[PDB]
Write a protein that binds this ligand. Structure first.
Ligand SMILES: CS(=O)(=O)Nc1cccc2[nH]ncc12
Length: 290
């Protein structure tokens, strides 16, 4: 069922909020008896014409994906007498991977981090078979179903590659998560599978820092750059730093072999970065040995 009538969609909780849209937890109860399905409902923060068109493309992308490690599309709800649009998704109860890492450290060890790493890689391989570039791969945009399962979410920045070319030039990006971007994304606005691989390197970094106090990518890059810098000066220094092999340090407790993977993902030469298939195989081989 992809129907969802607004009058049967009942509010339970406010979840995330920020850029573009906000997400609520709702119960869908057609039989009016207080016993139905729990879902996530995504709405626009500001419903302009431009944002509506983007939201429509996000919805088409999500509907096209069926994979264990990608959040499930359930449908749309045409609310306000069908003069508004909301996206209906499955509810994953443990929130973003970023929050989960902070809140549930008691149930997380290195084996679990490698499981999550592998699952993210598998999700990304699947994206590549559709020629979708995610552009925003980060622990805040990964969702946790349970202690054994994570799913890639937020496809708001996701783009399709053209017929022939391997890069997408994003004409004029708004607010940018610059500390997850590959050098070519910073200097040329060029986004590709290879730039998602760079970002994946940074996700792997986040996992092994356990999102600890002031070890996050923005905080570490700012330390190296100089905390007194502001404005475009930050970006100028980030670029120059990255072009001459400045990199995030190995987090404390992180094996050398896992840090080597990070550093291979952070190659300035786009063609020498591993594929997501290489990474999933290598990570599952590390796990299987032991
Ligand atoms: C990341 S968040 O905290 O804003 N919430 C979600 C977004 C998208 C799908 C979701 N399913 N469940 C929660 C959730």
């Amino acid at each position: 069922p992809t129907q969802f009538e607004e009058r049967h969609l009942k509010f339970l909780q406010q979840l995330g909020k920020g850029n573009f849209g906000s997400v609520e937890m709702c119960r869908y109860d057609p039989l009016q008896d207080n016993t139905g399905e729990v879902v996530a409902v995504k709405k626009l923060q500001h419903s302009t014409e431009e944002h509506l068109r983007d939201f429509e493309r996000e919805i088409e992308i999500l509907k096209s994906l069926q994979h264990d490690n990608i959040v499930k599309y359930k449908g749309v709800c045409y609310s306000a007498g069908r003069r508004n649009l909301k996206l209906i998704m499955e509810y994953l109860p443990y929130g973003s991977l970023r929050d989960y890492l902070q809140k549930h450290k008691e149930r997380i060890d290195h084996i679990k981090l490698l499981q999550y790493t592998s699952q993210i890689c598998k999700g990304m391989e699947y994206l590549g078979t559709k020629r979708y570039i995610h552009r925003d791969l980060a622990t805040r945009n990964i969702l946790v179903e349970n202690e054994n399962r994570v799913k890639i979410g937020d496809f708001g920045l996701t783009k399709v590659l053209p017929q022939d070319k391997e890069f997408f030039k994003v004409k004029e990006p708004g607010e940018s998560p610059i500390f997850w971007y590959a050098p070519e994304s910073l200097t040329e606005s060029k986004f590709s599978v290879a730039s998602d691989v760079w970002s994946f390197g940074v996700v792997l970094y986040e996992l092994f820092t356990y999102i600890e106090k002031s070890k996050s990518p923005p905080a570490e890059f700012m330390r190296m750059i100089g905390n007194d810098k502001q404005g475009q000066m930050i970006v100028f220094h980030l670029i120059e730093l990255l072009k001459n092999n400045g990199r995030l340090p190995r987090p404390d407790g992180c094996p050398d072999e896992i840090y080597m993977i990070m550093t291979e993902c952070w190659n300035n030469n786009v063609n020498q970065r591993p594929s997501f298939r290489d990474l999933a195989l290598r990570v599952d081989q590390i796990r299987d040995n032991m």
